Symmetry: C3
Subunit: 428 residues, 3 copies
Amino acid sequence: ENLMQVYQQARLSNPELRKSAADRDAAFEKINEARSPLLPQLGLGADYTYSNGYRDANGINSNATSASLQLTQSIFDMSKWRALTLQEKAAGIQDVTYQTDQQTLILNTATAYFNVLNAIDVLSYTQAQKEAIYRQLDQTTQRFNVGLVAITDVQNARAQYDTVLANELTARNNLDNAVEQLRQITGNYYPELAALNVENFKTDKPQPVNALLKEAEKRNLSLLQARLSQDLAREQIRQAQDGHLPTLDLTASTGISDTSYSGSKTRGAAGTQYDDSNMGQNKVGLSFSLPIYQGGMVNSQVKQAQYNFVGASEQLESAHRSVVQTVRSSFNNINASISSINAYKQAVVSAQSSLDAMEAGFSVGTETIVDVLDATTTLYNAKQELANARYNYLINQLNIKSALGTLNEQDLLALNNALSKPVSTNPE
Amino acid sequence: ENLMQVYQQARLSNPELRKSAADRDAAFEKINEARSPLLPQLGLGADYTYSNGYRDANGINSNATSASLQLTQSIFDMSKWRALTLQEKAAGIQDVTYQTDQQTLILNTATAYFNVLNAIDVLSYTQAQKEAIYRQLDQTTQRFNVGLVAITDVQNARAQYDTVLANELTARNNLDNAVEQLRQITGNYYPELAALNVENFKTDKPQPVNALLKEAEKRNLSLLQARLSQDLAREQIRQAQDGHLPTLDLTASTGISDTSYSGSKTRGAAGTQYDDSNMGQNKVGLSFSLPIYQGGMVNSQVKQAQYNFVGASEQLESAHRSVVQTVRSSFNNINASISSINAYKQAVVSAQSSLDAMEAGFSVGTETIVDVLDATTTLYNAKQELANARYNYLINQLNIKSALGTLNEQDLLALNNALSKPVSTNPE
Amino acid sequence: ENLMQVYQQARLSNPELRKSAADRDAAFEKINEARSPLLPQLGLGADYTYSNGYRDANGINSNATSASLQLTQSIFDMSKWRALTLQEKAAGIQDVTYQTDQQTLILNTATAYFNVLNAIDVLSYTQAQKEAIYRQLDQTTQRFNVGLVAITDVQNARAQYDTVLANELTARNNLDNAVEQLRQITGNYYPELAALNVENFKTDKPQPVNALLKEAEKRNLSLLQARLSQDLAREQIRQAQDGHLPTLDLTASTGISDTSYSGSKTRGAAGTQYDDSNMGQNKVGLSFSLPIYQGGMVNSQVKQAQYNFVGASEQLESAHRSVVQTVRSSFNNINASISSINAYKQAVVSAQSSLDAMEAGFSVGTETIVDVLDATTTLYNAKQELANARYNYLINQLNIKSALGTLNEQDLLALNNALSKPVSTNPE
Ligand SMILES: [Cl-]
Ligand SMILES: [Cl-]
Ligand SMILES: [Cl-]
Ligand SMILES: [K+]
Ligand SMILES: [K+]
Ligand SMILES: [K+]
């Protein structure tokens, strides 16, 4: 029923935002998988093998069983550490995209809200105009029954009337699909919304453009994310560079074995020389490894990593050049709106003088025909474009907030001042 | 020529649909790849080694040659079975995505079709207007030769006539590019298309809105595909969970081996030691394996898989809301159209009588030709919107079928009767 | 400030292009990582193991220390070669995707450039239009002081004037956002630009449409890319087929080893059985592999690759149809442009004489000045659409180059003295 109240409902169940939130959680949970390789690895394995000999190891043949519990532990390997750091960085980036998606739902709800309000005014002015054209037809049909005017008077007032009847539908339809889209973003239908209140509505000037621009540098989420991705691409070079380095792994195992020799030739061998042996061993061990050369694979991986970093740099610049033109065009548009409003307010008062003076004044004499209707078509156009400009202003205010990256639900809360009058979202 | 006639040719050569179809066949063929590890694995290998020994094994040498045929076979492993299930799931999802894409071709052909028809109307109404303004230039320029009118009217009617010539170009060119759109989809040029039969109409009230909802709910291809994706995500949770489980493998092999010894100090005491052995071995063997701890890896993967499933659920809820917004808006539009047709059908009769009765308003001076000049650009606007709403009605009929998920060839066959009259696509 | 000059600054620092270049430099570098498995792999490793043997393993302990330098070298493996061929293929595709992006920058700068000029023209005429409406408000307010007109005439001269005041602001604001769009591509603000010259202006008819298709057939980068993609798709089939062939690997190594046996059951007195050795080995060795059957995995992989090739085939068709649609749409557009130009060049002379002959019938007094109001809006709207068409034509020249696949810096030079008249971009 009110922008804030609407957003409140929208926020707690918007699937676009909730998907985003689930992406952030998984990203952060993946940190445990990335740390995984640094922690111990425990596993139990067992084996049976029945072999059967032939040719100077012929009549000798055996089946053997074993089982063992293995531990492995990675004392130092730089790749495994970088792998973790990278996932922390990845989860960091996902967090920012999620913050950016919170600001979109704000920016989108308002859009859908103000589109429904706009779709009303459009219909409402058409409505009032349909009647305004009608009253001209009514009078002319009276002024016809008793002489006075031709039929070249009736058909002008009938055509333009039948034109607007069809214009009423395309208008009435827009409102039904403005409301339906609001339901898509919010999750629920609204039979009424708080409309703009001309009594308590002021259009304040924004901070200087160079101050807005300076603030955006600090707080813009698009720009922030680009910095982190460059930070991410940098880290990835180290990872490629880690391939040259030594690695040391601890491994330990407990176990038992049993080989038994039975068969023709091995039915006794010299003096029990058939190795019927039940082994069993606790053992601990270290394995060192160092690459010396791998066909230039590692170097290639570094050089590739360095070029990608150049891309991430050039992407920071793209994000920046984008930020620089979003704060600037957002600034202009407010400065366009205030001017549009101030002009269109006097374009109404001017068109009001043409109504008050040449409409209500046109009872006797002067001019008839087309000069009758336009003294109000101008009054409606100006009235439409004025309310239109007012909503533009409101959205330009929110668009400057998101450029700064500081848009939250308190900027929707400030707009409870501008809204008051509950208005039907139904073509009555 | 006819709409279905056009679609038929498009359907069997369209590269987008056939790219889709091929993607769906790969998806299905991959089930054979995913099944693979469950089947037996056969392979042959061989090795040679020359060992020149120093240190405490100094003055000894060996040649060692071997060859063996290896068979492996997975007895039980859950994750391998999941692999297969997940590809069956993958292929199923692809077939639904292929169906959606069959429906888009129907949708997109009809659109391009009615664009070409639309572009003809625009052009031929601009054409009819061009002559209409011309006849008024002609009459004023000839009533000037007598000297009955001022030069401020022969230049006036010439000014409106030169605007319509320009408008006749950007309308001729629109038709050329509307046809090029239509060729891109179908594959071939068309010199003639069946345009609407402006006599026998098909304005028919659509199903109750909640029945349409009910049917979209269980037949929409987008919503079905979203449902299967969630099913897929859940199936992946179990796959992550499969990490903790034990596995059993068969590995049986036939092979032979040889070792031969040389070098200075190569024997030892009695029996002539370090002798050559010529092994030949038939072995069958099992290998049980059970992880216990893997540094919290599996556990992390199962949390990610759960968080992903949250996203897939929200994705469904998101796809749901889309459908709701589609049927309800396809409903509003098809009702807007129904009513819009009736209004412009009447606004044509209205703007008609304005140039039937005023077709004597130049035959004296009821309303000076200037009035009739810009009265002709009223009967043409009404006639434009009427055809415009008529085609937009036909598209809105398919759009609802699409939203119900049942858009078929029958829908196109039903529109043969609404067509019939062949109309040029390159007029003179 | 001239287009060519503008493009220079843009080209050297545009981040989208420089990202694309870094993408190509990395892809080419990837070839070294692709070739690497074919070259030697060299590595050093060392191992220590302590063990104690429980029961029958006879309380017999050991220390085991070893180190070894190991070389491995692929002798034949077709998959490895095939990996390298695919990477060259991949890098080549990038090169074309970079050539396309060198053309996009030209196309975009020209487009962003002309919108700025266009935004000035819109503003230029709107302002001159405002002086034109004010001209007639100035005179009506004069004619009311002595009292020759109804106060009704004043309001039409004012309420129509305030309308123009309003859409001069949205015209002014349009220019600033046009200059800001332009900055984003170039990185520079431009206070002055070289506007089009009305004389010194081209109108050359394009080559025959069939000649344009024939040249696009063998030079258009989009299908050049699509061809290489398909070429790539095939190369992957042969890669899937490599899975059946034999492989051979050379593996040489140098190393030393040392085991020692402590424990009270070794050092007693018997019975001399367990002895420790310090071994040193020089080893050279070959290893042969032939898969006989891998559970239908390779065959599935080949049949997958075959279907993927059908996709690439069908996408070559998709790419092709677009080209056809593009050259034909761009040919149609240049021919629309010339006609449009000639129409409006005639429709200016037409709107001229309509406010030249009516200009004379003002200084001697004739007809309605309300007619002279609407007459001046249609006098300027020919000028606004003429200069517009003239720019549209110039972009259409470039769109036919992009389609041929030969758009480069020379086409920006050809346009140099075609635009010599400098104009400001922030008029006060
Ligand atoms: Cl290397
Ligand atoms: Cl684990
Ligand atoms: Cl196979
Ligand atoms: K045998
Ligand atoms: K480099
Ligand atoms: K040595």
